[PDB]
């Protein structure tokens, strides 16, 4: 174990993100027992995870980590239980992790963050029903939006536009945002209101399409232009917590669920793969940048699993 690194890693793995160089970023919370905290980890050897002794870097955060994201190659943006959005900076040697800012701006658990396309701004979502736009350089909230009427579940930045992002709430709304508009949000989704939306991912190329997952295990594909739901599949038997597109030319979609399974789907939402490797909730997925058929999932079982995808 490196200097500054904790001797032990929090049981509940929340997040897993490959940097472009191929190294693994892990976020983890302690959701039970005496101390309810969280930690951040960097693994230059991804196959060594989750063992704390074979990490490149590691650090304790005050509260749990509800969501994570890379800023650039050295920045780590954190959604905390504490109400805080925090930015952690990576070391020069990349052997320690250092708090750059901790802002107590949300009134409840911050549950979701996404980095906007430029890399200079981010949007966060909270149980406090707010959605906030951050200046990362300035360490301030530029815009604060109460669009929703129940806690916010997911916020996703568009692949290429700094002012466009999706959000979804327990108030049954999926909102397409565009901060260029006087009234920024616009309500989108299928004809009939359905089951609550629980996860969102933009298509990395067709910059006008996204998938969304609901609390009933259904993954659905939406077009913003034709403003209606095209395809849908019953993928999972429990709520869909994450959706991750592969880096591939025509991309695959990883689907992860509280049913403890991973699934991988093609463009038409047909099932190519499924993994029961996990024995608790599956919280994240990342595709190796180095090996485009390699996929990593983490769970609340403390497994870091590397899947080989056909």
């Amino acid at each position: 174990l490196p200097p500054n690194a904790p001797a032990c890693m929090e049981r509940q793995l929340e997040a897993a993100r490959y940097r472009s160089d191929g190294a693994l970023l892990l976020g983890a919370s302690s959701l039970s027992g005496r101390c309810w905290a969280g930690s951040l980890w960097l693994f230059k050897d991804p196959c060594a995870a989750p063992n704390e002794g074979f990490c490149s870097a590691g650090v304790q955060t005050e509260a749990g980590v509800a969501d994570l994201t890379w800023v650039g190659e050295r920045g780590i943006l954190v959604a905390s239980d504490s109400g805080a959005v925090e930015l952690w900076e990576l070391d020069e040697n990349e052997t320690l992790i250092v708090s750059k800012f901790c802002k107590y701006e949300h009134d409840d658990i911050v549950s979701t963050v996404s980095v906007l396309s430029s890399g200079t701004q981010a949007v966060s979502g909270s149980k406090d029903i707010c959605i906030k736009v951050w200046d990362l350089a300035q360490q301030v909230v530029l815009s604060s939006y109460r669009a929703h009427a129940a806690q916010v579940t997911c916020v996703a930045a568009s692949p290429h536009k700094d002012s466009v992002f999706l959000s979804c709430s327990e108030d049954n709304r999926i909102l397409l945002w565009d901060t260029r508009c006087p009234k920024p949000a616009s309500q989108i989704g299928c004809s009939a209101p359905g089951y609550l939306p629980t996860s969102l991912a933009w298509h990395p190329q067709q910059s006008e399409v996204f998938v969304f997952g609901d609390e009933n295990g259904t993954v659905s594909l939406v077009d913003t232009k034709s403003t209606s739901c095209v395809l849908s599949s019953a993928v999972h038997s429990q709520c869909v917590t994450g959706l991750v597109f592969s880096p591939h030319s025509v991309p695959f979609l990883a689907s992860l669920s509280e049913d403890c399974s991973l699934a991988v789907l093609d463009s038409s939402l047909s099932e190519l793969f499924r993994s029961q490797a996990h024995r608790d909730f599956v919280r994240d997925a990342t595709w190796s940048p180095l090996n485009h058929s390699l996929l990593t999932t983490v769970g609340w079982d403390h497994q870091v699993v590397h899947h080989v995808v056909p």
Partner: protein, 303 residues
């Protein structure tokens, strides 16, 4: 003076947090009894068999501290009235579990939201818990003066907020509570934790709540304005309401983060204690009648 508590939805170490808030001036803390994100599963394998501990240990506080300093909070993922059957079932079981733990701990109070119209099943579960042993402890329903849906920003192009006249609609929230409490057969154990917002609704909506069992009033940091010297204070209107609530001797609860950054959390509190010390002293009748408020007597019959 004023009995007041802190509402937190994040507690990394209970010992420390309780110390922090006590130092800050608070009489009690409202906090999760399970980690708010710690969604449990009760039927389907393998998550069902998730090794324990399911939460943090009772040994962490004295019996007395549990009895007097802590108010439980239902986990916010527990949705007994969801339209999805599997969520409804886990939620029933989860609610029982957290309810049973509060009782196991001996908590004096325990918070549950009414944050939508239909809480039939929440009511059914609570009523059941109520009739499973006879206990003293209170259930505070956390209801807002104004419903979230009627408080949102007018910022959806294709779903505008309706600016027309809605006498009945602006009372929707009272009906949420009315119905819940009717279903639960007016149990003396179920009281109101009234949530106050930046925008007070019409005065009539504050009329509704007049005779209701309000045991606590929740003040988000969000609603405080700032004076010249940067201290937190409240609009004239909000003061009027506080004064009404002081007369009813509710407990006050501060929720949310500190937004007046150059001040301690104790400054919000200091303002409240300022307001109560600055209320007109009770007249001679009010001193005599003091111990007797809503105490029912037989009329005297000296014949």
């Amino acid at each position: 003076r004023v009995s007041s508590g802190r509402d937190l939805n994040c507690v990394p170490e209970i010992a420390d947090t309780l110390g922090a808030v006590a130092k800050q001036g608070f009489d009690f803390l409202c906090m999760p009894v399970f980690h708010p994100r710690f969604k449990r599963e009760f039927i389907q394998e393998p998550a069902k068999n998730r090794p324990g501990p399911q939460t943090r240990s009772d040994l962490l506080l004295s019996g007395r501290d549990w009895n007097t300093l802590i108010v439980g909070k239902l986990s916010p993922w527990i949705r007994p009235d969801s339209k999805v059957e599997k969520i409804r079932r886990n939620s029933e079981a989860a609610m029982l579990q957290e309810l049973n733990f509060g009782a196991y701990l001996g908590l004096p109070a325990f918070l549950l939201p009414l944050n939508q119209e239909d809480n039939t099943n929440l009511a059914r579960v609570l009523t059941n818990h109520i009739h499973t042993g006879h206990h003293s402890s209170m259930f505070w329903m956390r209801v807002p003066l104004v419903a979230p849906e009627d408080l949102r920003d007018d910022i959806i192009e294709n779903a505008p907020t309706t600016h027309t006249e809605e006498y009945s609609g602006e009372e929707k929230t009272w009906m949420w509570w009315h119905n819940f409490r009717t279903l639960c057969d007016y149990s003396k154990r179920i009281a109101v934790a009234l949530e106050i917002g930046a925008d007070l609704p019409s005065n009539h909506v504050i009329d509704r709540w007049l005779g209701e069992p309000i045991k606590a009033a929740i003040l988000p940091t969000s609603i405080f304005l700032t004076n010249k010297k940067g201290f937190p204070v409240l609009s004239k209107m909000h003061q009027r309401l506080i004064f009404r609530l002081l007369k009813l001797e509710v407990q006050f609860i501060i929720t949310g983060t500190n937004h007046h950054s150059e001040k301690e959390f104790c400054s919000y509190l200091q303002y409240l204690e300022y307001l109560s010390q600055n209320r007109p002293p009770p007249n001679a009748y009010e001193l005599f009648a003091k111990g007797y408020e809503d105490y029912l007597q037989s009329p005297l019959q000296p014949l």
